[PDB]
């Protein structure tokens, strides 16, 4: 009940359930602070996760997941209740 798969190019994903780095642990918030561009280093794609705003010390990191197309526990007001 936790979807740890990411998308690099549409015929391959990246799994983070058993292996992986700490970068799975990023939550969702449709009011974002971070996004993940697809930057390639040395000829494979990598999923690197940039920032949008100044993030404070011990502030929570956010993200849009972009589940396209068909429940947001963020408790923030201006956000779509579902995902």
């Amino acid at each position: 009940g936790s979807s740890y798969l990411f998308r690099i190019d549409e015929n391959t994903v990246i799994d983070a359930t058993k292996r992986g780095g700490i970068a799975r642990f990023i939550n969702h918030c449709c009011e974002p602070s971070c996004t993940a561009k697809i930057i390639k280093v040395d000829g494979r794609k990598r999923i690197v996760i940039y920032a949008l705003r100044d993030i404070g010390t011990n502030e929570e990191l956010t993200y849009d997941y972009k589940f396209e197309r068909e429940p947001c526990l963020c408790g923030a007001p201006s956000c779509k209740g579902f995902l």
Partner: peptide, 8 residues
């Protein structure tokens, strides 16, 4: 569906 993604 539930797979996270960028730009779609």
């Amino acid at each position: 569906a539930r797979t996270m993604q960028t730009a779609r």
